[PDB]
Amino acid sequence: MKKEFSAGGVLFKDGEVLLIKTPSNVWSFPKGNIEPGEKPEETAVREVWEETGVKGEILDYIGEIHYWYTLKGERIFKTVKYYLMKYKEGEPRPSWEVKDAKFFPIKEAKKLLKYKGDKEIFEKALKLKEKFKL
Numbered sequence: 001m002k003k004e005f006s007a008g009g010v011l012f013k014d015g016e017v018l019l020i021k022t023p024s025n026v027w028s029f030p031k032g033n034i035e036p037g038e039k040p041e042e043t044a045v046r047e048v049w050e051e052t053g054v055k056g057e058i059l060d061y062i063g064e065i066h067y068w069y070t071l072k073g074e075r076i077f078k079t080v081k082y083y084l085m086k087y088k089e090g091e092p093r094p095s096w097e098v099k100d101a102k103f104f105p106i107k108e109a110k111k112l113l114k115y116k117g118d119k120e121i122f123e124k125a126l127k128l129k130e131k132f133k134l
């Protein structure tokens with residue numbers, strides 16, 4: 001069993017949340033592997049920009065999710081740390097690794113999300129952002 005560790009962001013702009021559509025056609029949150037020499041917060045900010053071209057600023061830590069996945073028979077146990085972010089600059093645009101990047105009203109975002117962890121993280125992010133007048 002292999003272990004992986006990523007960090008991502010749940011970024012809001014004027015009430016809407018930033019999402020990306022994966023190659024599998026699933027809408028999820030922008031994230032990436034925590035590279036050697038990076039703290040998870042650094043990874044999250046960098047990955048949001050590389051994947052969506054949007055610059056965000058971390059307001060606080062939201063939570064962590066876990067999931068198992070297989071690839072060509074290998075099994076990997078993956079952990080993703082998510083951070084709440086406020087929109088700073090830029091216009092959503094997909095990286096070469098994603099199909100699309102776009103802002104969605106909270107309501108539509110709820111219907112688009114699929115992964116158990118994403119739904120759980122989103123709910124936590126929503127409660128948490130009210131505190132930051134976001």
Ligand SMILES: Nc1ncnc2c1ncn2[C@@H]1O[C@H](COP(=O)(O)OP(=O)(O)OP(=O)(O)OP(=O)(O)OC[C@H]2O[C@@H](n3cnc4c(N)ncnc43)[C@H](O)[C@@H]2O)[C@@H](O)[C@H]1O
Pocket residue numbers: 001002003004005034
């Ligand atoms: N992704 C992968 N690719 C290829 N081969 C793999 C692999 N994962 C495992 N393997 C292979 O599978 C084997 C089994 O390894 P595991 O099963 O990974 O390890 P352990 O033996 O459980 O002790 P360990 O090192 O896990 O614990 P620690 O809490 O320190 O470590 C906690 C984990 O957290 C990560 N981590 C800890 N601190 C971190 C930090 N500060 N920032 C980012 N990541 C951090 C570490 O990378 C560490 O694995 C390894 O022998 C390896 O050969």
Ligand SMILES: Nc1ncnc2c1ncn2[C@@H]1O[C@H](COP(=O)(O)OP(=O)(O)OP(=O)(O)O)[C@@H](O)[C@H]1O
Pocket residue numbers: 006024028031032033065066067068069070078115116117118
């Ligand atoms: N939150 C989640 N819960 C469950 N499964 C997930 C989740 N996210 C992704 N997956 C599934 O796990 C597998 C790997 O996706 P993941 O996104 O982790 O891959 P990746 O592209 O290598 O990673 P990173 O984006 O960290 O660069 C896929 O089969 C995917 O459908």
